[PDB]
């Protein structure tokens, strides 16, 4: 009903079924399942679009969280912005592997052999192994989106898939979702002309689907949202107001500039600081391992009670 | 002067020098040099930005053109949107190589060995080889941008670097450049609130720097622009008007929906259709090889006359 005015992504019915099969198989083994949403959505201004209003998100938080959930034993349904950061691969950009990998001869017997200095691709072998172990166990399903429209439909299909697991399902909503849009009927047909003067656009508020998600689509699930602010004077109050309005369990609050090194875990009655050490930034650890460790422990208590 | 109101990207002075050294070394060997710009720019709406107005461009046209220019003997200065399509690598996304590559043992003597089914990564060895040959010859310099501000400053620094080569330099301007912006003084300081009603924004026209580029920064260079339209009734007229206004040599015209299979090469007095065959889409060829073949031949005639 609120999602009906947005066009469906290609293959939406096929995706919904694939997601339903994934979750039902993992629930049958007794495993917990998390929907990790990651990256930003965009919205068009024209019917044949050449420009988009895009919410900022590299996808690092989501990708790194998916890795940490996989290592903790969860099944992961990874709903992500196409081309944003991908689990295990995101530490090895194109120029790194293009210059490090070298063929060790021509391909013989249908097999290509490659070599690299280990110190040029640190952790590369462990990345390939982790990804391949998850694919083989069937614990990692990837679903791409691009537009706000694609995201809203796929999020509704994922919630339908996870609703049968009751409290064993977790939603980890890290995606940066467009707050404004132009409805299909008010868009010009063709490219906007820059010689036609300043661009004056009014964009309507996107309906906040966290209400129906929590109340109707997945009412028994353990639901975690993120709250992004730029102003440190107001972030706590804004995170608490989110819980009051939407009635879900936890908010992970963060400030744009410090987001890689600090989050605040906010509930209705408490706040917990998670700050990365001097002795932890050296020994390799990422903030997402500490988030996931706090959340899995909370999820255990939620399932048991 | 028109670029002064935009902030400089980090290391702008270091980049300008690196670019100047690249071009001077290639000109000393007698080689032609092309600036390929690729990907889209974005502009912020807030001083601490969480959202951006982004012009659409995958970077495929630019990446594929850089490959074809390298194979034709040019030196290539590749000014590109960070994370958009990268030469040689763009045919092998993360999930393709994550599942295909496997370690053949632990790393011994500091060397990591890997293998893959050749049919899972077709062309992979030839990609590594081409990239490594260009790095070794010093014919390929990569320069990243993200914002409109970063792009405008780096484009001016590249033009300064290529100006000493006179007619042996080519500009191939495929980047999708923001047409509107919000000046530093009219931006709100903090994240815009979605509960505050519809978003109403007026954005000023970005000044068209193709005029000073052609008239002042690189007046002897062979300059090729792109013209993107969505409406096939008007594209030819718009491409001709661009040449009349900016006074450069060639426009590569294209329609959004058919851009992978068709361009029109437009000059002041002629148009040339470049359409990819049935017998060419099978035998592998891309439209950018046919573009580059038409352009290099034109560049020869421009240098000689
Ligand atoms: N502000 C700018 N400075 C430098 N180059 C630009 C700028 N804007 C566009 N370009 C380049 O100019 C060429 C034309 O882009 P295009 O968007 O088709 O036309 P336009 O001149 O921007 N007018 P419009 O159709 O209103 O967008 C392309 O090669 C772009 O890379
Ligand atoms: N329209 C939506 N539908 C579903 N989830 C959303 C939507 N908008 C935001 N979210 C999620 O809601 C949480 C809050 O996002 P955030 O941008 O901090 O607050 P907001 O509710 O959008 N209000 P504001 O601060 O004005 O943007 C995040 O987990 C987002 O993924
Ligand atoms: C800041 C963000 C996007 C993580 O950043 P990144 O994807 O790791 O660059 C994250 O932690 C978060 O706060 N997500 C909710 C964003 C809210 C919105 O604008 O919809
Ligand atoms: C359409 C485009 C961006 C190539 O697309 P893609 O980067 O290959 O997805 C190209 O051929 C082109 O026409 N570039 C000029 C775009 C003009 C603008 O919006 O600034
Ligand atoms: Mg928001
Ligand atoms: Mg334009």
XYZ file of C-alpha atoms and ligand atoms in Angstrom:
714
model
C 0.000 0.000 0.000
C 2.622 2.787 0.875
C 5.164 0.950 -1.407
C 2.652 0.668 -4.372
C 3.441 4.069 -5.855
C 7.077 3.107 -6.412
C 7.921 0.843 -9.397
C 8.985 -2.761 -8.640
C 12.540 -3.814 -9.367
C 13.119 -6.393 -12.145
C 12.657 -9.935 -10.822
C 11.018 -8.871 -7.522
C 8.868 -12.035 -7.356
C 11.941 -14.260 -8.072
C 13.941 -12.506 -5.313
C 11.159 -12.845 -2.750
C 11.097 -16.609 -3.325
C 14.906 -17.018 -3.182
C 14.954 -15.067 0.110
C 12.108 -17.218 1.571
C 13.911 -20.437 0.703
C 17.205 -19.145 2.282
C 15.656 -18.217 5.572
C 13.459 -21.351 5.856
C 16.497 -23.636 5.274
C 18.579 -21.745 7.940
C 15.722 -21.690 10.482
C 15.294 -25.500 9.967
C 18.954 -25.935 11.081
C 18.238 -23.761 14.157
C 20.493 -20.890 13.049
C 19.896 -17.212 13.649
C 19.456 -14.993 10.508
C 20.227 -11.262 10.119
C 19.169 -8.900 7.336
C 22.078 -6.467 6.906
C 21.187 -3.444 4.760
C 24.115 -1.486 3.429
C 24.944 1.499 1.199
C 22.797 4.420 0.135
C 19.669 4.768 -1.995
C 19.113 7.277 -4.755
C 16.086 8.976 -6.335
C 15.588 10.341 -9.867
C 14.477 13.843 -10.796
C 13.469 13.018 -14.418
C 11.534 10.137 -16.119
C 14.643 9.320 -18.256
C 17.084 10.070 -15.509
C 20.551 11.585 -15.906
C 20.873 12.819 -12.291
C 19.918 11.513 -8.863
C 19.711 12.800 -5.265
C 21.980 10.199 -3.497
C 22.367 9.652 0.301
C 26.009 9.162 1.309
C 27.301 5.714 2.479
C 30.502 3.879 1.400
C 29.024 0.490 2.536
C 32.013 -0.198 4.809
C 29.933 -0.434 7.979
C 27.561 -2.941 6.379
C 30.272 -5.055 4.658
C 32.387 -5.250 7.824
C 29.278 -6.084 9.907
C 28.305 -8.904 7.495
C 31.796 -10.409 7.989
C 31.526 -10.191 11.744
C 27.979 -11.754 11.732
C 29.217 -14.637 9.552
C 32.125 -15.313 11.954
C 29.584 -15.279 14.890
C 27.520 -18.132 13.258
C 24.597 -16.159 11.782
C 23.157 -16.592 8.356
C 23.333 -13.273 6.523
C 20.897 -11.820 4.007
C 22.955 -8.909 2.577
C 20.724 -6.277 0.851
C 23.186 -3.799 -0.613
C 23.714 -0.869 -2.978
C 25.173 -2.299 -6.201
C 28.894 -1.551 -6.349
C 29.179 -0.278 -2.773
C 31.602 -2.094 -0.439
C 31.438 -5.894 -0.649
C 32.380 -8.293 2.227
C 36.031 -9.555 2.161
C 36.768 -7.867 -1.215
C 36.530 -4.234 -0.092
C 40.087 -4.236 1.330
C 41.525 -5.102 -2.137
C 40.645 -2.407 -4.665
C 41.281 -2.894 -8.508
C 44.653 -1.156 -8.648
C 45.969 -3.265 -5.714
C 45.204 -6.629 -7.341
C 45.949 -5.494 -10.932
C 49.518 -4.745 -9.989
C 50.125 -7.583 -7.483
C 48.816 -10.697 -9.407
C 50.984 -12.215 -12.167
C 50.398 -15.278 -14.400
C 52.970 -18.013 -13.712
C 52.624 -19.429 -17.302
C 49.911 -19.822 -19.933
C 46.758 -21.709 -18.846
C 47.343 -25.473 -19.278
C 44.738 -28.205 -18.825
C 42.092 -25.423 -18.436
C 43.811 -24.077 -15.225
C 45.184 -20.541 -14.780
C 47.981 -20.177 -12.215
C 48.842 -16.876 -10.611
C 51.394 -15.640 -8.014
C 51.898 -12.559 -5.879
C 54.285 -11.255 -3.163
C 52.389 -12.069 0.082
C 53.288 -8.632 1.508
C 51.524 -6.911 -1.497
C 48.086 -8.565 -0.669
C 48.033 -9.090 3.131
C 45.071 -11.210 4.204
C 44.098 -12.119 0.622
C 44.125 -15.912 1.104
C 42.144 -15.684 4.360
C 39.529 -13.483 2.506
C 39.086 -16.026 -0.318
C 38.723 -18.799 2.232
C 36.138 -17.045 4.377
C 33.987 -16.106 1.406
C 34.180 -19.628 -0.093
C 33.257 -21.295 3.302
C 30.096 -19.149 3.534
C 29.026 -19.886 -0.091
C 29.596 -23.653 0.541
C 27.514 -23.636 3.820
C 24.739 -21.553 2.059
C 24.892 -18.919 4.902
C 25.336 -15.784 2.739
C 22.765 -14.482 0.247
C 23.438 -11.243 -1.644
C 20.643 -9.032 -3.062
C 21.496 -5.783 -4.979
C 19.493 -2.593 -5.079
C 20.096 0.848 -6.603
C 17.066 3.191 -6.298
C 14.856 4.023 -3.290
C 12.073 2.145 -5.204
C 14.186 -1.051 -5.476
C 15.165 -0.804 -1.782
C 11.568 -0.369 -0.416
C 10.216 -3.366 -2.361
C 13.175 -5.641 -1.481
C 13.032 -4.678 2.200
C 9.348 -5.708 2.268
C 10.157 -9.011 0.566
C 13.032 -9.675 3.047
C 10.718 -8.993 6.031
C 8.207 -11.539 4.632
C 11.012 -14.045 4.338
C 12.219 -13.503 7.987
C 8.797 -13.231 9.685
C 8.474 -17.081 10.144
C 11.668 -17.171 12.322
C 10.053 -14.951 14.974
C 12.575 -13.723 17.515
C 15.494 -15.627 15.882
C 15.569 -13.057 13.073
C 17.464 -9.771 13.376
C 17.213 -6.634 11.229
C 20.396 -4.489 11.111
C 19.368 -1.400 9.200
C 22.582 0.433 8.214
C 21.386 1.655 4.824
C 21.250 5.360 4.192
C 17.685 5.728 2.839
C 16.493 8.742 0.734
C 14.385 11.131 2.842
C 12.819 12.951 -0.147
C 11.494 12.014 -3.616
C 9.642 13.270 -6.719
C 6.479 11.213 -7.471
C 6.229 9.593 -10.973
C 3.483 12.121 -12.000
C 5.417 15.367 -11.246
C 8.668 14.492 -13.120
C 9.622 16.059 -16.451
C 10.000 13.588 -19.254
C 13.438 14.589 -20.622
C 16.838 15.800 -19.339
C 16.635 19.107 -17.467
C 18.320 21.934 -19.395
C 21.036 23.871 -17.577
C 20.568 26.979 -19.798
C 17.019 27.251 -18.409
C 18.011 29.072 -15.173
C 18.477 27.907 -11.615
C 17.059 24.476 -10.659
C 14.078 24.889 -8.341
C 12.726 21.600 -7.075
C 10.304 20.686 -4.284
C 10.600 17.061 -3.187
C 7.993 15.299 -1.014
C 8.899 13.430 2.194
C 9.398 9.714 1.695
C 7.060 7.750 4.026
C 8.921 6.209 6.999
C 8.492 2.430 6.543
C 10.147 1.540 9.844
C 6.544 1.848 11.391
C 4.855 -0.867 9.273
C 8.069 -2.970 9.384
C 7.956 -3.096 13.192
C 4.120 -3.227 13.611
C 2.972 -5.407 10.634
C 5.746 -7.023 8.451
C 7.989 -8.552 11.087
C 6.422 -7.958 14.537
C 8.436 -10.578 16.494
C 11.854 -9.816 15.131
C 14.810 -8.237 16.942
C 15.057 -4.825 15.132
C 18.174 -2.555 15.237
C 18.240 0.817 13.469
C 21.032 3.290 12.969
C 20.734 7.059 13.683
C 23.050 9.384 11.724
C 23.538 12.955 12.887
C 26.155 15.679 12.184
C 25.491 17.654 15.418
C 26.862 16.108 18.675
C 24.618 18.352 20.908
C 21.454 16.529 19.699
C 22.271 12.926 18.771
C 21.212 11.248 22.015
C 17.813 12.955 22.104
C 17.242 12.077 18.416
C 18.108 8.378 19.016
C 15.702 8.184 21.976
C 12.908 9.870 19.983
C 13.379 7.223 17.262
C 12.680 4.419 19.766
C 9.617 6.296 21.118
C 8.132 6.742 17.627
C 8.968 3.360 16.001
C 8.907 1.045 19.121
C 11.756 -1.231 18.041
C 14.571 -2.477 20.364
C 17.958 -0.728 19.775
C 19.457 2.300 17.995
C 23.145 2.407 16.986
C 23.852 6.179 17.056
C 26.780 7.812 15.229
C 28.232 11.179 14.179
C 29.351 11.465 10.575
C 33.001 12.545 11.186
C 33.831 9.973 13.941
C 31.781 6.990 12.669
C 34.712 4.695 12.007
C 35.978 4.899 15.619
C 32.878 5.515 17.804
C 29.235 4.458 18.191
C 26.680 4.816 20.965
C 24.275 1.838 21.568
C 21.007 3.472 22.714
C 17.945 1.773 24.206
C 14.801 3.261 25.924
C 16.590 3.274 29.289
C 20.394 3.167 28.674
C 23.378 4.298 26.519
C 26.637 2.383 25.989
C 29.777 3.900 24.468
C 31.807 1.792 22.067
C 35.133 3.373 21.360
C 38.041 1.778 19.602
C 41.379 1.741 21.693
C 44.981 2.800 20.891
C 45.883 -0.932 21.693
C 43.016 -2.160 19.382
C 43.645 0.112 16.326
C 47.217 -1.422 16.328
C 46.103 -5.096 16.843
C 43.770 -4.771 13.729
C 40.240 -4.710 15.258
C 37.310 -2.837 13.657
C 34.442 -1.186 15.427
C 31.962 -3.577 13.765
C 33.318 -6.596 15.636
C 32.521 -4.769 18.920
C 29.025 -3.797 17.661
C 28.244 -7.346 16.634
C 29.548 -8.761 19.920
C 27.141 -6.335 21.908
C 24.201 -7.145 19.581
C 24.520 -10.909 19.520
C 24.537 -10.931 23.344
C 21.399 -8.704 23.399
C 19.742 -11.000 20.780
C 20.389 -14.051 23.030
C 18.538 -12.305 25.932
C 15.697 -11.262 23.611
C 15.212 -14.824 22.292
C 15.300 -16.374 25.789
C 12.666 -13.941 27.355
C 39.117 32.982 -11.051
C 35.792 31.055 -11.849
C 37.269 27.978 -10.006
C 38.311 30.058 -6.881
C 34.962 29.786 -5.118
C 35.215 25.994 -4.986
C 37.513 24.417 -2.343
C 40.747 22.766 -3.569
C 41.119 19.018 -3.271
C 43.760 17.661 -0.844
C 47.193 17.570 -2.492
C 46.199 19.725 -5.504
C 49.706 21.230 -5.819
C 51.317 17.728 -5.613
C 48.961 16.408 -8.334
C 49.631 19.330 -10.666
C 53.366 18.604 -10.492
C 52.982 14.826 -11.009
C 50.783 15.505 -14.066
C 53.329 18.022 -15.495
C 56.181 15.551 -15.135
C 54.117 12.755 -16.847
C 53.239 14.794 -19.873
C 56.715 16.364 -20.296
C 58.380 12.899 -20.228
C 55.883 11.516 -22.848
C 56.185 14.584 -25.111
C 60.033 14.213 -24.969
C 59.621 10.677 -26.438
C 57.377 12.122 -29.191
C 54.217 10.357 -27.984
C 50.698 11.712 -28.135
C 48.895 12.234 -24.750
C 45.134 12.159 -24.034
C 43.286 13.350 -20.934
C 40.363 10.935 -20.502
C 37.780 12.158 -17.977
C 35.394 9.538 -16.705
C 32.509 9.066 -14.251
C 30.186 11.610 -12.699
C 30.665 14.501 -10.280
C 28.570 15.233 -7.231
C 27.662 18.345 -5.221
C 26.738 18.718 -1.535
C 23.628 20.377 -0.144
C 24.952 20.816 3.443
C 28.301 21.967 4.990
C 28.656 18.550 6.748
C 27.192 16.606 3.895
C 25.048 13.473 4.148
C 23.464 13.781 0.670
C 24.633 14.827 -2.781
C 23.105 15.660 -6.190
C 25.031 13.133 -8.415
C 25.155 13.055 -12.270
C 24.810 9.515 -13.637
C 27.810 7.714 -15.275
C 29.047 4.124 -14.680
C 32.553 5.034 -16.038
C 32.422 2.227 -18.622
C 32.796 4.549 -21.607
C 35.860 6.210 -20.082
C 37.524 2.974 -18.839
C 37.011 1.211 -22.179
C 38.272 4.305 -24.060
C 41.429 4.454 -21.887
C 42.149 0.811 -22.841
C 41.664 1.517 -26.513
C 43.906 4.674 -26.359
C 46.658 2.679 -24.615
C 46.521 -0.033 -27.319
C 46.745 2.765 -30.002
C 50.088 4.056 -28.510
C 48.883 7.130 -26.583
C 49.895 8.086 -23.110
C 46.781 8.358 -20.956
C 46.075 10.748 -18.097
C 42.944 9.148 -16.551
C 40.978 11.648 -14.367
C 38.190 9.568 -12.868
C 35.431 9.365 -10.259
C 36.812 7.323 -7.346
C 35.343 3.822 -7.443
C 33.733 4.170 -10.874
C 34.812 1.705 -13.590
C 38.570 1.111 -13.773
C 40.469 0.036 -16.959
C 40.968 -3.776 -17.346
C 39.466 -4.529 -13.886
C 35.873 -3.478 -14.592
C 35.032 -6.796 -16.310
C 35.888 -8.735 -13.093
C 33.656 -7.626 -10.226
C 34.338 -8.750 -6.527
C 31.973 -11.719 -6.496
C 33.509 -13.097 -9.742
C 37.087 -13.172 -8.422
C 36.141 -14.062 -4.809
C 34.607 -17.299 -5.974
C 37.035 -18.171 -8.811
C 40.505 -17.699 -7.123
C 41.788 -20.400 -4.739
C 45.089 -20.656 -2.803
C 47.177 -23.618 -4.000
C 48.940 -23.936 -0.564
C 50.101 -21.645 2.236
C 52.484 -18.817 1.233
C 56.076 -20.159 1.210
C 59.228 -18.095 0.697
C 57.015 -14.938 0.838
C 55.075 -16.013 -2.349
C 51.310 -16.624 -2.532
C 50.166 -19.010 -5.278
C 46.632 -19.043 -6.590
C 44.684 -21.017 -9.254
C 41.391 -20.688 -11.084
C 39.401 -22.477 -13.843
C 40.295 -20.438 -16.978
C 36.636 -20.501 -18.104
C 35.575 -18.769 -14.790
C 37.811 -15.646 -15.487
C 38.004 -15.291 -19.302
C 40.577 -12.695 -20.333
C 41.972 -12.303 -16.797
C 45.625 -13.009 -17.680
C 45.520 -10.686 -20.709
C 44.062 -7.908 -18.411
C 46.878 -8.267 -15.845
C 49.435 -8.175 -18.635
C 48.060 -5.087 -20.348
C 47.837 -3.124 -17.118
C 51.364 -4.151 -16.025
C 52.881 -3.210 -19.484
C 51.406 0.312 -19.210
C 52.657 0.827 -15.605
C 56.162 -0.386 -16.682
C 56.281 1.997 -19.746
C 54.963 4.918 -17.539
C 52.115 5.578 -20.088
C 49.155 5.519 -17.650
C 48.622 8.012 -14.819
C 45.491 7.778 -12.660
C 44.023 10.780 -10.777
C 40.847 10.369 -8.607
C 38.149 12.926 -7.994
C 34.803 12.840 -6.170
C 33.103 16.279 -5.959
C 32.477 18.915 -8.658
C 35.038 21.064 -6.719
C 37.752 18.359 -6.975
C 36.992 17.844 -10.691
C 37.176 21.583 -11.686
C 40.542 22.117 -9.960
C 42.086 18.886 -11.332
C 40.855 19.603 -14.863
C 42.599 23.005 -14.719
C 45.806 21.399 -13.456
C 45.656 18.731 -16.234
C 45.198 21.437 -18.915
C 48.311 23.247 -17.582
C 50.215 19.997 -17.801
C 49.124 19.312 -21.464
C 49.403 22.883 -22.818
C 53.184 22.506 -23.655
C 52.436 19.605 -26.100
C 50.366 21.890 -28.350
C 48.437 19.937 -30.955
C 49.847 16.549 -29.795
C 47.569 16.672 -26.745
C 43.954 15.488 -26.861
C 41.132 16.109 -24.378
C 38.407 13.405 -24.310
C 35.767 14.799 -21.999
C 33.416 11.912 -21.107
C 32.760 12.953 -17.515
C 29.229 13.732 -16.483
C 29.708 17.136 -14.793
C 27.193 18.656 -12.284
C 25.104 21.397 -13.933
C 23.905 22.956 -10.643
C 25.390 23.699 -7.192
C 24.809 25.417 -3.823
C 27.520 28.027 -3.021
C 29.456 27.585 0.297
C 27.634 30.642 1.822
C 24.011 29.460 1.252
C 24.371 25.921 2.733
C 22.940 24.938 6.115
C 25.518 23.794 8.595
C 23.965 20.489 9.758
C 21.986 17.542 8.320
C 18.637 18.576 6.835
C 15.707 17.272 8.900
C 13.111 15.189 7.069
C 10.367 16.007 9.640
C 10.698 19.669 8.602
C 8.439 19.397 5.504
C 9.171 19.096 1.816
C 12.722 19.921 0.627
C 12.720 23.156 -1.365
C 16.091 23.975 -2.852
C 17.229 26.459 -5.503
C 20.609 25.589 -7.000
C 22.667 28.023 -9.114
C 24.027 27.121 -12.569
C 27.595 25.866 -12.515
C 29.780 28.017 -14.829
C 30.648 26.220 -18.099
C 34.461 25.863 -18.012
C 34.707 24.429 -21.521
C 35.000 28.167 -22.707
C 38.175 29.066 -20.751
C 39.566 25.538 -21.364
C 39.380 26.030 -25.140
C 40.247 29.790 -25.235
C 42.866 30.173 -22.419
C 44.071 26.924 -20.669
C 44.879 24.723 -23.639
C 44.317 26.732 -26.856
C 46.295 24.472 -29.249
C 44.980 21.139 -28.115
C 42.684 18.752 -29.998
C 39.463 18.976 -27.864
C 36.610 16.384 -27.998
C 33.461 16.781 -25.893
C 30.528 14.480 -25.377
C 26.849 15.572 -25.658
C 24.283 13.553 -23.671
C 20.601 13.889 -24.486
C 17.476 11.785 -23.727
C 15.401 13.158 -26.663
C 16.349 11.869 -30.173
C 14.419 14.729 -31.950
C 16.942 17.335 -30.671
C 20.372 15.745 -30.206
C 21.941 16.800 -33.506
C 20.955 20.454 -33.117
C 22.248 20.449 -29.508
C 25.629 18.956 -30.571
C 26.047 21.581 -33.314
C 25.140 24.419 -30.917
C 27.865 23.160 -28.545
C 30.523 23.568 -31.263
C 29.193 27.061 -32.135
C 29.362 28.225 -28.501
C 32.634 26.585 -27.324
C 34.633 26.530 -30.655
C 36.371 23.198 -30.075
C 36.815 20.459 -32.754
C 34.476 17.429 -32.279
C 31.375 16.361 -30.324
C 30.612 12.677 -29.635
C 26.784 12.721 -29.364
C 24.758 9.985 -27.635
C 21.272 9.105 -26.363
C 21.081 7.684 -22.861
C 19.236 4.397 -23.669
C 21.337 3.386 -26.743
C 24.772 4.676 -25.623
C 26.477 1.303 -25.466
C 25.707 0.493 -29.133
C 25.542 3.868 -30.962
C 27.276 7.259 -31.140
C 27.201 10.116 -33.627
C 30.540 11.953 -34.332
C 29.507 15.577 -35.009
C 31.653 18.395 -36.401
C 30.687 21.932 -37.670
C 30.021 20.547 -41.158
C 29.409 16.751 -40.891
C 27.890 13.828 -38.896
C 29.146 10.224 -38.859
C 27.165 7.291 -37.464
C 29.020 4.650 -35.487
C 26.867 1.634 -34.908
C 27.987 -1.697 -33.590
C 27.167 -4.737 -35.955
C 25.476 -8.133 -35.362
C 28.864 -9.646 -36.632
C 30.843 -7.332 -34.225
C 28.765 -7.833 -31.010
C 29.540 -11.613 -31.486
C 33.304 -11.179 -32.291
C 33.730 -9.172 -28.969
C 34.250 -5.554 -30.170
C 33.154 -2.506 -28.129
C 31.970 0.798 -29.457
C 34.948 2.580 -27.849
C 37.456 0.875 -30.141
C 35.549 2.353 -33.131
C 35.417 5.818 -31.476
C 39.127 5.786 -30.768
C 39.957 4.592 -34.288
C 37.904 7.619 -35.788
C 39.491 10.082 -33.313
C 43.103 9.040 -33.682
C 42.788 9.426 -37.474
C 41.246 12.922 -37.018
C 44.048 13.818 -34.524
C 46.698 12.839 -37.134
C 45.116 15.289 -39.661
C 44.875 18.014 -37.003
C 48.563 17.661 -36.034
C 49.752 17.649 -39.670
C 47.775 20.854 -40.733
N 30.955 22.946 -15.932
C 31.719 22.271 -16.790
N 33.070 22.442 -16.903
C 33.746 21.664 -17.803
N 33.159 20.729 -18.613
C 31.860 20.539 -18.561
C 31.038 21.287 -17.626
N 29.773 20.896 -17.763
C 29.801 19.959 -18.755
N 31.059 19.729 -19.183
C 31.461 18.857 -20.305
O 30.716 19.477 -21.388
C 30.214 18.451 -22.329
C 28.715 18.566 -22.456
O 27.958 17.984 -21.342
P 26.365 18.012 -21.463
O 25.783 17.687 -20.098
O 25.833 17.116 -22.546
O 25.997 19.541 -21.967
P 25.978 20.927 -21.038
O 26.902 21.806 -21.764
O 26.322 20.528 -19.610
N 24.373 21.413 -21.189
P 23.012 20.522 -20.700
O 22.432 19.595 -21.755
O 22.036 21.544 -20.109
O 23.571 19.652 -19.595
C 30.711 17.088 -21.779
O 31.935 16.704 -22.410
C 31.006 17.405 -20.287
O 32.096 16.642 -19.756
N 11.865 5.510 4.477
C 12.444 4.543 5.189
N 12.014 3.246 5.201
C 12.715 2.341 5.951
N 13.816 2.647 6.705
C 14.259 3.883 6.746
C 13.614 4.929 5.971
N 14.263 6.072 6.176
C 15.257 5.759 7.056
N 15.265 4.442 7.346
C 16.132 3.763 8.329
O 15.773 4.494 9.532
C 16.957 4.686 10.399
C 17.158 6.157 10.668
O 17.782 6.901 9.569
P 18.087 8.448 9.830
O 18.403 9.099 8.494
O 19.163 8.679 10.854
O 16.714 9.047 10.524
P 15.285 9.433 9.753
O 14.304 8.623 10.485
O 15.480 9.172 8.266
N 15.149 11.075 10.094
P 16.250 12.283 9.633
O 17.364 12.558 10.630
O 15.399 13.495 9.242
O 16.889 11.688 8.398
C 18.138 3.996 9.666
O 18.320 2.661 10.143
C 17.639 3.929 8.196
O 18.116 2.775 7.494
C 27.035 6.274 8.511
C 26.638 4.844 8.047
C 25.874 5.041 6.713
C 27.917 4.060 7.777
O 28.793 4.746 6.820
P 29.646 3.905 5.746
O 28.484 3.123 4.845
O 30.478 2.873 6.491
O 30.334 4.946 4.898
C 25.909 4.217 9.181
O 26.592 3.847 10.313
C 24.519 4.758 9.473
O 24.500 5.579 10.388
N 23.497 4.412 8.702
C 22.186 4.996 8.909
C 22.109 6.218 7.889
C 20.749 6.938 7.956
C 20.252 7.607 6.573
O 20.758 8.684 6.059
O 19.287 6.952 6.082
C 26.792 8.725 -21.167
C 28.308 8.787 -20.825
C 28.386 9.428 -19.416
C 28.838 7.359 -20.753
O 28.074 6.535 -19.808
P 28.816 5.427 -18.908
O 29.892 6.313 -17.998
O 29.589 4.496 -19.828
O 27.735 4.866 -18.017
C 28.967 9.498 -21.952
O 29.092 8.881 -23.172
C 28.695 10.990 -22.062
O 27.819 11.263 -22.880
N 29.307 11.838 -21.247
C 28.984 13.250 -21.275
C 27.896 13.453 -20.128
C 27.463 14.925 -19.999
C 27.031 15.392 -18.515
O 25.923 15.050 -17.936
O 27.908 16.154 -18.014
Mg 17.027 10.022 7.222
Mg 25.271 19.071 -18.620
